[PDB]
Design a binder for this molecule. Structure first.
Ligand SMILES: [Zn+2]
Ligand SMILES: [Zn+2]
Ligand SMILES: [Zn+2]
Ligand SMILES: [Zn+2]
Lengths: 45, 45
């Protein structure tokens, strides 16, 4: 049962996005905070 | 640093792939073994 992969920083948040500006996997909190204004896509997208 | 994310199964393997069949982040070993023949793309593409 290792379906969900979580953020290294926000431990209970699933990594569901990829920040293109940083070539970095991100969770919702990462994308709205440290990565605000960066270009991104949800992984499924 | 905390940006590179490593697989929880294959400890020294980074999650660089996304298995489209399962909508799940995978590392090289995950993709070739547990996800054999599933559709995938490297995150960077
Ligand atoms: Zn995060
Ligand atoms: Zn970013
Ligand atoms: Zn798969
Ligand atoms: Zn793996």
């Amino acid at each position: 049962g290792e379906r969900t992969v979580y953020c290294n920083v926000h431990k209970h948040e699933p990594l569901v996005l990829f920040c293109e500006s940083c070539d970095t996997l991100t969770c919702r909190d990462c994308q709205l905070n440290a990565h605000k204004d960066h270009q991104y896509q949800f992984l499924e997208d």
